[PDB]
Protein backbone atom coordinates (compact mmCIF):
# COMPACT_ATOMS: atom_id res chain seq x y z
CA UNK A 1 0.00 0.00 0.00
CA UNK A 2 2.17 2.83 -1.34
CA UNK A 3 0.54 6.26 -1.42
CA UNK A 4 1.18 8.36 -4.51
CA UNK A 5 3.47 11.29 -3.53
CA UNK A 6 1.17 14.18 -4.35
CA UNK A 7 2.26 16.07 -1.23
CA UNK A 8 5.68 16.88 -2.69
CA UNK A 9 4.00 18.46 -5.74
CA UNK A 10 1.03 20.37 -4.32
CA UNK A 11 2.52 21.26 -0.92
CA UNK A 12 6.00 22.14 -2.20
CA UNK A 13 7.63 25.19 -0.64
CA UNK A 14 9.13 26.77 -3.77
CA UNK A 15 7.79 26.48 -7.32
CA UNK A 16 9.41 26.81 -10.73
CA UNK A 17 9.09 29.52 -13.36
CA UNK A 18 6.71 28.91 -16.26
CA UNK A 19 9.53 28.72 -18.82
CA UNK A 20 11.31 26.18 -16.58
CA UNK A 21 8.26 24.17 -15.51
CA UNK A 22 9.09 21.27 -13.22
CA UNK A 23 8.21 17.71 -14.24
CA UNK A 24 7.79 14.78 -11.84
CA UNK A 25 7.05 11.17 -12.80
CA UNK A 26 4.63 9.16 -10.66
CA UNK A 27 4.33 5.39 -11.02
CA UNK A 28 3.79 2.29 -8.87
CA UNK A 29 1.51 3.75 -6.21
CA UNK A 30 -2.15 4.23 -5.26
CA UNK A 31 -3.76 7.65 -5.68
CA UNK A 32 -6.97 8.88 -4.03
CA UNK A 33 -8.13 11.67 -6.35
CA UNK A 34 -11.26 12.23 -4.25
CA UNK A 35 -9.07 13.89 -1.61
CA UNK A 36 -7.95 16.51 -4.15
CA UNK A 37 -11.40 16.85 -5.73
CA UNK A 38 -12.99 17.50 -2.31
CA UNK A 39 -10.56 20.03 -0.82
CA UNK A 40 -12.54 23.26 -1.43
CA UNK A 41 -9.29 25.22 -1.73
CA UNK A 42 -8.63 25.32 -5.50
CA UNK A 43 -9.88 28.21 -7.61
CA UNK A 44 -9.54 26.27 -10.88
CA UNK A 45 -10.02 22.51 -11.25
CA UNK A 46 -10.74 21.47 -14.84
CA UNK A 47 -10.15 18.02 -16.30
CA UNK A 48 -10.20 17.05 -19.98
CA UNK A 49 -10.74 13.57 -21.38
CA UNK A 50 -11.59 12.09 -18.00
CA UNK A 51 -14.51 12.94 -15.71
CA UNK A 52 -13.40 14.38 -12.34
CA UNK A 53 -16.50 12.93 -10.64
CA UNK A 54 -15.13 9.83 -8.89
CA UNK A 55 -13.28 8.28 -11.84
CA UNK A 56 -10.31 7.01 -9.82
CA UNK A 57 -11.15 3.39 -10.71
CA UNK A 58 -9.00 3.57 -13.87
CA UNK A 59 -5.45 2.28 -14.28
CA UNK A 60 -2.82 4.46 -15.95
CA UNK A 61 0.73 3.78 -17.11
CA UNK A 62 2.29 6.94 -15.67
CA UNK A 63 1.32 10.30 -14.18
CA UNK A 64 3.36 13.36 -15.15
CA UNK A 65 2.97 16.26 -12.72
CA UNK A 66 4.05 19.64 -14.12
CA UNK A 67 4.33 22.60 -11.75
CA UNK A 68 4.76 26.31 -12.43
CA UNK A 69 3.48 29.79 -11.50
CA UNK A 70 1.65 32.35 -13.67
CA UNK A 71 -0.63 35.35 -13.19
CA UNK A 72 -4.40 35.13 -12.93
CA UNK A 73 -5.34 36.47 -16.36
CA UNK A 74 -3.13 33.81 -17.98
CA UNK A 75 -4.84 30.85 -16.27
CA UNK A 76 -7.31 30.68 -19.17
CA UNK A 77 -4.36 29.93 -21.47
CA UNK A 78 -3.63 26.56 -19.79
CA UNK A 79 -6.09 24.61 -21.93
CA UNK A 80 -6.18 22.91 -25.34
CA UNK A 81 -6.45 25.23 -28.33
CA UNK A 82 -5.30 28.44 -26.63
CA UNK A 83 -3.13 31.30 -27.84
CA UNK A 84 -1.14 33.86 -25.90
CA UNK A 85 2.21 34.35 -24.22
CA UNK A 86 2.19 31.16 -22.14
CA UNK A 87 0.58 28.91 -24.75
CA UNK A 88 2.92 30.03 -27.54
CA UNK A 89 6.29 30.56 -25.85
CA UNK A 90 6.26 28.99 -22.36
CA UNK A 91 3.90 26.02 -21.93
CA UNK A 92 1.79 24.46 -24.69
CA UNK A 93 -0.77 21.69 -24.22
CA UNK A 94 -1.85 19.40 -27.08
CA UNK A 95 -5.34 19.63 -28.54
CA UNK A 96 -6.04 16.00 -27.54
CA UNK A 97 -5.02 16.50 -23.91
CA UNK A 98 -6.19 13.83 -21.45
CA UNK A 99 -5.52 14.97 -17.90
CA UNK A 100 -6.33 17.42 -15.12
CA UNK A 101 -5.44 21.07 -14.45
CA UNK A 102 -5.42 22.61 -10.97
CA UNK A 103 -4.65 26.25 -10.21
CA UNK A 104 -4.90 28.16 -6.93
CA UNK A 105 -4.05 31.64 -5.73
CA UNK A 106 -0.69 32.01 -3.97
CA UNK A 107 -0.55 35.71 -3.11
CA UNK A 108 0.25 34.79 0.51
CA UNK A 109 3.43 32.87 -0.42
CA UNK A 110 4.88 33.84 -3.81
CA UNK A 111 4.26 37.58 -3.41
CA UNK A 112 7.01 39.81 -2.03
CA UNK A 113 6.77 43.38 -0.72
CA UNK A 114 9.10 45.29 -3.02
CA UNK A 115 8.66 42.87 -5.89
CA UNK A 116 9.26 39.16 -6.48
CA UNK A 117 11.29 39.26 -9.69
CA UNK A 118 12.48 35.63 -9.62
CA UNK A 119 9.49 34.36 -11.64
CA UNK A 120 10.18 34.84 -15.34
CA UNK A 121 8.48 34.14 -18.66
CA UNK A 122 9.80 34.01 -22.22
CA UNK A 123 8.53 36.86 -24.40
CA UNK A 124 10.42 36.44 -27.69
CA UNK A 125 11.00 33.35 -29.82
CA UNK A 126 11.50 32.53 -33.49
CA UNK A 127 8.56 30.09 -33.59
CA UNK A 128 5.79 28.67 -31.43
CA UNK A 129 6.52 25.85 -29.01
CA UNK A 130 5.50 22.30 -29.79
CA UNK A 131 3.32 20.57 -27.17
CA UNK A 132 5.17 19.63 -23.97
CA UNK A 133 8.35 21.40 -25.12
CA UNK A 134 10.69 23.24 -22.76
CA UNK A 135 13.16 25.98 -23.71
CA UNK A 136 15.72 27.30 -21.22
CA UNK A 137 18.03 29.16 -23.62
CA UNK A 138 19.05 32.79 -23.10
CA UNK A 139 20.19 33.75 -26.60
CA UNK A 140 19.55 37.37 -27.60
CA UNK A 141 16.55 37.69 -29.91
CA UNK A 142 16.98 39.50 -33.23
CA UNK A 143 14.04 41.85 -33.74
CA UNK A 144 15.16 43.77 -36.82
CA UNK A 145 17.79 43.10 -39.49
CA UNK A 146 20.98 44.18 -37.70
CA UNK A 147 22.70 41.20 -36.01
CA UNK A 148 22.98 41.45 -32.24
CA UNK A 149 26.50 39.92 -32.08
CA UNK A 150 25.76 38.65 -28.57
CA UNK A 151 24.99 42.09 -27.11
CA UNK A 152 21.73 43.84 -26.27
CA UNK A 153 20.72 47.18 -27.75
CA UNK A 154 18.39 48.55 -30.40
CA UNK A 155 16.15 45.75 -31.70
CA UNK A 156 18.10 43.29 -29.53
CA UNK A 157 16.20 42.05 -26.48
CA UNK A 158 16.81 39.57 -23.69
CA UNK A 159 14.16 36.88 -24.29
CA UNK A 160 13.01 36.67 -20.65
CA UNK A 161 10.79 39.11 -18.75
CA UNK A 162 10.06 39.23 -15.03
CA UNK A 163 6.72 39.17 -13.25
CA UNK A 164 6.27 41.85 -10.63
CA UNK A 165 4.49 40.15 -7.74
CA UNK A 166 3.24 42.44 -4.95
CA UNK A 167 0.50 41.92 -2.33
CA UNK A 168 -1.31 45.09 -3.48
CA UNK A 169 -1.69 44.02 -7.12
CA UNK A 170 -5.05 43.13 -8.59
CA UNK A 171 -6.38 39.60 -8.93
CA UNK A 172 -5.35 39.61 -12.59
CA UNK A 173 -1.77 40.41 -11.55
CA UNK A 174 -1.49 38.06 -8.50
CA UNK A 175 0.47 34.79 -8.49
CA UNK A 176 -1.32 31.53 -9.26
CA UNK A 177 0.30 28.14 -8.74
CA UNK A 178 -0.57 25.64 -11.48
CA UNK A 179 -0.19 21.85 -11.41
CA UNK A 180 -1.02 19.84 -14.54
CA UNK A 181 -1.47 16.07 -14.27
CA UNK A 182 -1.04 14.10 -17.51
CA UNK A 183 -2.14 10.45 -17.64
CA UNK A 184 -0.17 8.21 -19.99
CA UNK A 185 -1.98 5.20 -21.51
CA UNK A 186 0.22 2.82 -23.51
CA UNK A 187 0.76 -0.93 -23.93
CA UNK A 188 2.19 -1.29 -20.44
CA UNK A 189 1.24 -2.94 -17.12
CA UNK A 190 -0.23 0.43 -16.00
CA UNK A 191 0.62 0.06 -12.32
CA UNK A 192 -1.05 3.38 -11.37
CA UNK A 193 -4.63 2.33 -10.58
CA UNK A 194 -5.38 4.06 -7.28
CA UNK A 195 -8.56 2.35 -6.02
Amino acid sequence: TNLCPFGEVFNATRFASVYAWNRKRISNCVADYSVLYNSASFSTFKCYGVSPTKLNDLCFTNVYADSFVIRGDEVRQIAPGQTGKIADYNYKLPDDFTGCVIAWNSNNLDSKVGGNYNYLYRLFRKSNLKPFERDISTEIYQAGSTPCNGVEGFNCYFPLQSYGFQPTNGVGYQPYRVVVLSFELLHAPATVCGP
Partner: antibody
Protein backbone atom coordinates in the same frame (compact mmCIF):
# COMPACT_ATOMS: atom_id res chain seq x y z
CA UNK B 1 8.21 53.63 -43.98
CA UNK B 2 6.13 52.67 -40.95
CA UNK B 3 3.11 54.92 -40.40
CA UNK B 4 -0.49 54.88 -39.19
CA UNK B 5 -3.46 56.88 -40.52
CA UNK B 6 -6.66 57.58 -38.57
CA UNK B 7 -10.11 58.21 -40.01
CA UNK B 8 -13.67 58.39 -38.74
CA UNK B 9 -13.97 61.41 -36.46
CA UNK B 10 -16.68 64.02 -36.44
CA UNK B 11 -19.67 65.35 -34.52
CA UNK B 12 -22.09 63.01 -32.72
CA UNK B 13 -25.03 63.81 -30.47
CA UNK B 14 -24.84 62.45 -26.90
CA UNK B 15 -25.91 58.83 -26.67
CA UNK B 16 -24.98 58.23 -30.31
CA UNK B 17 -22.36 55.99 -31.87
CA UNK B 18 -19.16 56.18 -33.90
CA UNK B 19 -16.43 53.99 -35.37
CA UNK B 20 -12.81 54.99 -36.00
CA UNK B 21 -10.32 53.12 -38.17
CA UNK B 22 -6.52 53.20 -38.22
CA UNK B 23 -4.63 51.81 -41.22
CA UNK B 24 -0.99 50.79 -40.86
CA UNK B 25 1.69 50.58 -43.54
CA UNK B 26 5.39 49.80 -43.56
CA UNK B 27 5.68 46.95 -41.05
CA UNK B 28 4.08 43.56 -40.48
CA UNK B 29 0.70 44.10 -38.85
CA UNK B 30 0.18 40.60 -37.43
CA UNK B 31 3.34 40.62 -35.28
CA UNK B 32 2.46 43.55 -33.01
CA UNK B 33 -0.20 44.53 -30.49
CA UNK B 34 -1.94 47.88 -30.80
CA UNK B 35 -3.17 50.52 -28.35
CA UNK B 36 -5.68 53.36 -28.47
CA UNK B 37 -4.86 56.61 -26.64
CA UNK B 38 -6.87 59.81 -26.32
CA UNK B 39 -6.30 63.44 -25.35
CA UNK B 40 -9.01 65.84 -24.22
CA UNK B 41 -8.79 69.52 -25.22
CA UNK B 42 -6.27 71.15 -22.92
CA UNK B 43 -5.74 67.94 -20.96
CA UNK B 44 -3.27 65.06 -20.63
CA UNK B 45 -2.92 61.65 -22.22
CA UNK B 46 -5.27 58.81 -21.33
CA UNK B 47 -4.87 55.16 -22.29
CA UNK B 48 -8.04 53.53 -23.65
CA UNK B 49 -7.64 49.96 -24.93
CA UNK B 50 -5.11 47.33 -26.02
CA UNK B 51 -5.44 44.45 -28.49
CA UNK B 52 -3.07 41.53 -29.09
CA UNK B 53 -1.79 40.18 -32.41
CA UNK B 54 -4.83 37.92 -32.95
CA UNK B 55 -7.59 39.48 -30.81
CA UNK B 56 -7.55 37.05 -27.89
CA UNK B 57 -6.66 39.47 -25.06
CA UNK B 58 -8.44 42.83 -24.80
CA UNK B 59 -8.23 45.25 -21.88
CA UNK B 60 -10.03 48.56 -21.40
CA UNK B 61 -9.97 51.45 -18.95
CA UNK B 62 -12.45 51.78 -16.10
CA UNK B 63 -14.10 54.81 -17.73
CA UNK B 64 -14.72 53.09 -21.09
CA UNK B 65 -15.63 49.60 -19.89
CA UNK B 66 -18.69 48.16 -21.62
CA UNK B 67 -19.29 51.14 -23.89
CA UNK B 68 -16.19 50.74 -26.09
CA UNK B 69 -15.09 47.82 -28.25
CA UNK B 70 -11.70 47.24 -29.89
CA UNK B 71 -11.13 45.07 -32.95
CA UNK B 72 -8.62 44.48 -35.72
CA UNK B 73 -8.49 43.03 -39.23
CA UNK B 74 -5.15 41.54 -40.25
CA UNK B 75 -6.00 41.03 -43.93
CA UNK B 76 -7.02 44.69 -44.30
CA UNK B 77 -4.24 45.88 -41.94
CA UNK B 78 -6.78 47.94 -39.99
CA UNK B 79 -7.61 48.65 -36.34
CA UNK B 80 -11.18 49.56 -35.37
CA UNK B 81 -12.59 51.27 -32.27
CA UNK B 82 -16.37 51.35 -31.75
CA UNK B 83 -18.01 53.74 -29.27
CA UNK B 84 -21.53 53.08 -27.99
CA UNK B 85 -23.40 55.30 -25.53
CA UNK B 86 -21.13 58.24 -26.30
CA UNK B 87 -20.82 60.74 -23.44
CA UNK B 88 -20.05 64.45 -23.33
CA UNK B 89 -16.62 63.80 -21.77
CA UNK B 90 -15.53 61.49 -24.61
CA UNK B 91 -14.79 64.48 -26.86
CA UNK B 92 -11.08 64.18 -27.64
CA UNK B 93 -8.36 63.43 -30.17
CA UNK B 94 -7.64 59.73 -30.69
CA UNK B 95 -4.31 58.10 -31.58
CA UNK B 96 -3.44 54.53 -32.59
CA UNK B 97 -0.06 53.25 -31.40
CA UNK B 98 1.97 50.09 -31.97
CA UNK B 99 3.77 48.10 -29.28
CA UNK B 100 7.10 46.27 -29.44
CA UNK B 101 5.60 42.81 -28.80
CA UNK B 102 2.56 40.78 -29.86
CA UNK B 103 0.70 40.91 -26.53
CA UNK B 104 1.25 44.30 -24.87
CA UNK B 105 0.25 43.32 -21.33
CA UNK B 106 3.35 44.73 -19.58
CA UNK B 107 6.80 46.05 -20.43
CA UNK B 108 6.22 47.94 -23.66
CA UNK B 109 6.33 51.31 -25.37
CA UNK B 110 4.34 53.09 -28.09
CA UNK B 111 6.93 53.66 -30.80
CA UNK B 112 4.84 54.70 -33.87
CA UNK B 113 1.94 57.13 -33.41
CA UNK B 114 -0.71 58.25 -35.87
CA UNK B 115 -1.85 61.76 -36.70
CA UNK B 116 -4.97 61.54 -34.53
CA UNK B 117 -8.66 62.10 -35.24
CA UNK B 118 -11.11 64.45 -33.52
CA UNK B 119 -14.37 63.16 -32.03
CA UNK B 120 -16.77 65.77 -30.64
CA UNK B 121 -19.96 64.96 -28.72
CA UNK B 122 -22.43 67.81 -28.27
CA UNK B 123 -26.14 68.50 -28.63
CA UNK C 1 -4.47 51.97 -10.08
CA UNK C 2 -0.91 53.30 -10.05
CA UNK C 3 -0.63 57.06 -9.62
CA UNK C 4 2.32 58.84 -11.25
CA UNK C 5 3.61 62.24 -10.13
CA UNK C 6 6.00 64.54 -12.01
CA UNK C 7 8.21 67.24 -10.52
CA UNK C 8 8.00 70.01 -11.35
CA UNK C 9 4.91 71.01 -13.35
CA UNK C 10 6.57 73.84 -15.31
CA UNK C 11 10.26 74.68 -15.71
CA UNK C 12 11.79 77.67 -17.51
CA UNK C 13 15.23 77.00 -18.99
CA UNK C 14 17.51 78.72 -21.50
CA UNK C 15 19.46 77.34 -24.44
CA UNK C 16 22.51 75.34 -23.40
CA UNK C 17 21.29 74.43 -19.91
CA UNK C 18 20.87 71.10 -18.12
CA UNK C 19 17.30 70.00 -17.37
CA UNK C 20 16.24 67.30 -14.91
CA UNK C 21 12.69 66.00 -14.46
CA UNK C 22 11.58 63.51 -11.81
CA UNK C 23 8.80 60.93 -12.03
CA UNK C 24 7.56 59.00 -9.00
CA UNK C 25 5.23 56.00 -8.80
CA UNK C 26 2.90 54.90 -6.00
CA UNK C 27 4.10 51.28 -6.29
CA UNK C 28 7.30 49.58 -7.41
CA UNK C 29 7.28 49.09 -11.18
CA UNK C 30 10.87 47.83 -11.63
CA UNK C 31 12.26 49.15 -14.97
CA UNK C 32 8.93 49.46 -16.80
CA UNK C 33 8.92 53.25 -17.29
CA UNK C 34 8.91 55.19 -20.56
CA UNK C 35 9.47 58.88 -21.36
CA UNK C 36 7.50 60.60 -24.14
CA UNK C 37 7.75 64.07 -25.69
CA UNK C 38 4.86 65.99 -27.26
CA UNK C 39 4.81 69.34 -29.08
CA UNK C 40 1.66 71.45 -29.59
CA UNK C 41 -0.60 70.23 -32.38
CA UNK C 42 1.44 67.10 -33.15
CA UNK C 43 1.52 63.47 -32.08
CA UNK C 44 3.67 62.49 -29.08
CA UNK C 45 7.16 61.12 -29.63
CA UNK C 46 9.08 58.31 -27.92
CA UNK C 47 12.23 59.43 -26.11
CA UNK C 48 13.19 56.80 -23.51
CA UNK C 49 12.10 53.19 -23.06
CA UNK C 50 12.81 50.68 -20.28
CA UNK C 51 14.13 53.14 -17.69
CA UNK C 52 17.41 53.83 -19.54
CA UNK C 53 17.51 53.07 -23.27
CA UNK C 54 17.68 55.68 -26.02
CA UNK C 55 15.47 55.47 -29.11
CA UNK C 56 16.91 55.43 -32.62
CA UNK C 57 17.05 58.94 -34.05
CA UNK C 58 17.02 60.60 -30.62
CA UNK C 59 20.09 62.80 -29.97
CA UNK C 60 22.56 61.61 -27.35
CA UNK C 61 21.83 64.59 -25.07
CA UNK C 62 18.79 62.77 -23.64
CA UNK C 63 19.27 60.29 -20.81
CA UNK C 64 17.22 58.44 -18.23
CA UNK C 65 18.00 56.70 -14.97
CA UNK C 66 16.04 54.98 -12.24
CA UNK C 67 14.62 51.78 -10.82
CA UNK C 68 11.68 51.05 -8.53
CA UNK C 69 9.64 54.10 -7.55
CA UNK C 70 12.01 56.91 -8.59
CA UNK C 71 13.10 57.90 -12.10
CA UNK C 72 14.86 60.87 -13.68
CA UNK C 73 15.10 62.28 -17.21
CA UNK C 74 18.08 64.50 -18.04
CA UNK C 75 18.95 66.80 -20.95
CA UNK C 76 22.61 67.82 -20.92
CA UNK C 77 22.68 70.58 -23.56
CA UNK C 78 19.44 72.40 -24.34
CA UNK C 79 18.51 73.19 -27.95
CA UNK C 80 15.74 75.30 -29.51
CA UNK C 81 13.93 72.08 -30.53
CA UNK C 82 13.64 70.76 -26.96
CA UNK C 83 10.97 73.12 -25.54
CA UNK C 84 7.96 70.79 -25.34
CA UNK C 85 5.84 68.73 -22.93
CA UNK C 86 7.28 65.61 -21.29
CA UNK C 87 5.32 62.64 -19.95
CA UNK C 88 6.30 59.58 -17.91
CA UNK C 89 4.33 56.36 -18.38
CA UNK C 90 4.31 53.05 -16.53
CA UNK C 91 4.15 49.75 -18.41
CA UNK C 92 3.72 47.55 -15.34
CA UNK C 93 0.01 46.68 -15.43
CA UNK C 94 -3.31 47.67 -17.02
CA UNK C 95 -4.63 50.32 -16.92
CA UNK C 96 -1.57 52.27 -18.05
CA UNK C 97 -1.26 55.71 -16.46
CA UNK C 98 0.67 58.79 -17.56
CA UNK C 99 1.91 61.72 -15.54
CA UNK C 100 0.34 65.18 -15.48
CA UNK C 101 3.17 66.51 -17.66
CA UNK C 102 6.03 68.98 -17.32
CA UNK C 103 6.26 71.95 -19.70
CA UNK C 104 9.57 73.60 -20.64
CA UNK C 105 9.49 77.19 -21.91
CA UNK C 106 12.13 79.65 -23.09
CA UNK C 107 13.55 81.79 -20.29
CA UNK C 108 13.64 85.59 -20.24
Amino acid sequence: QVQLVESGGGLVQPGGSLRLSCAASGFTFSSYGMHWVRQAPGKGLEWVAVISYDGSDKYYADSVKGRFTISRDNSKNTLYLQMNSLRAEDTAVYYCARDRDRFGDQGGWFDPWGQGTLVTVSS
Amino acid sequence: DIQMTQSPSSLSASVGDRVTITCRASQSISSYLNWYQQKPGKAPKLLIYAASSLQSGVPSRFSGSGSGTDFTLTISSLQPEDFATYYCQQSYSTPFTFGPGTKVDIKR
